[PDB]
Design a protein around this ligand. Structure first.
Ligand SMILES: Cc1ccc(Nc2nsnc(Nc3ccc(C(N)=O)cc3)c2=O)cc1O
Ligand SMILES: [Mg+2]
Length: 265
């Protein structure tokens, strides 16, 4: 299929909505990742899915950082059902697959976690709360560095932080204060970064249940416990415990994560 200067090829992946296809650009002889979305399918899937897509378009047009995925072009005719989002091509796999029997080593987890810190610090500096941080939304670029993706449920704010009351995101990564109020958006992202880091070294989420009610009660009430294997350093366990503090008041903040001994060694 030909679309403007692009030759559409096979399906290579999926977004939270839409399919990703390989797209050859005839003008610069470079390949791109093209996310193909049906407006009709987004409407039937119902901030609903179509509002999530247009939020992401609006956020990604304003951002420029080495740890944020690059949106190159949007093809959207208002009288056509399909809209196309063209991104810089990255690795086919994300930072890691979850659940996995082969989790990251501690050096690799530190390297990717340092990228995640830089990316989240930039987003927070740009007044954006991501709200869906997880390994499958952490792409890996040609440079070998993390590129944050999926801005569909993000929130922009004016002032020092976002003071929010709604529950959005991926259930396994949602902070306990959002499942029981007004709460800090930055601390929600810190909790999800904690669930992500736990996933990097254990290959599984810290709180898991097939039943969404039970998953939520575990996030709110199950004390954090580390598996016996793999053995991980005490400083890493200490950092994860502080990021997965159920009380957002006492949860570690990003400036403090940057001075944590596991991060600085
Ligand atoms: C053989 C091969 C095949 C594929 C790839 N690369 C990709 N595969 S899948 N999706 C990608 N990029 C996105 C963009 C946005 C979103 C999103 N969630 O908005 C997710 C992934 C890729 O660049 C690389 C390869 O050498
Ligand atoms: Mg991999």
């Amino acid at each position: 299929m030909q679309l403007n200067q692009y030759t559409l090829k096979d399906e290579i992946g999926k977004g939270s909505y839409g399919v990703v296809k390989l797209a050859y650009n005839e003008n610069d002889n470079t390949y791109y990742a093209m996310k193909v979305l049906s407006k009709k399918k987004l409407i039937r899937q119902a901030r609903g899915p179509i509002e999530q897509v247009y939020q992401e378009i609006a956020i990604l047009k304003k951002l420029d950082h080495p740890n944020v995925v690059k949106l190159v072009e949007v093809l959207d005719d208002p009288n056509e059902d399909h809209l196309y989002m063209v991104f810089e091509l990255v690795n086919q796999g994300p930072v890691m697959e979850v659940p996995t029997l082969k989790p990251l080593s501690e050096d690799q987890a530190r390297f990717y976690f340092q990228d995640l810190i830089k990316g989240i610090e930039y987003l927070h500096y740009q007044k954006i709360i991501h709200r869906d941080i997880k390994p499958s939304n952490l792409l890996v670029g040609e440079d070998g560095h993390i590129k944050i993706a999926d801005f569909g449920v993000s929130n922009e704010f004016k002032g020092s932080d976002a003071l929010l009351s709604n529950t959005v995101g991926t259930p396994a990564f949602m902070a306990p204060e959002s499942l029981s109020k007004i709460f800090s958006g930055k601390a929600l992202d810190v909790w999800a970064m904690g669930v992500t880091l736990y996933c990097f070294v254990f290959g599984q989420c810290p709180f898991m249940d097939e039943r969404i009610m039970c998953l939520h009660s575990k996030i709110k009430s199950q004390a954090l416990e580390f598996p016996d294997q793999p053995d991980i350093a005490e400083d890493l366990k200490d950092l994860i415990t502080r990021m997965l503090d159920k009380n957002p008041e006492s949860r570690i903040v990003v400036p403090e994560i940057k001075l944590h001994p596991w991060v600085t060694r």
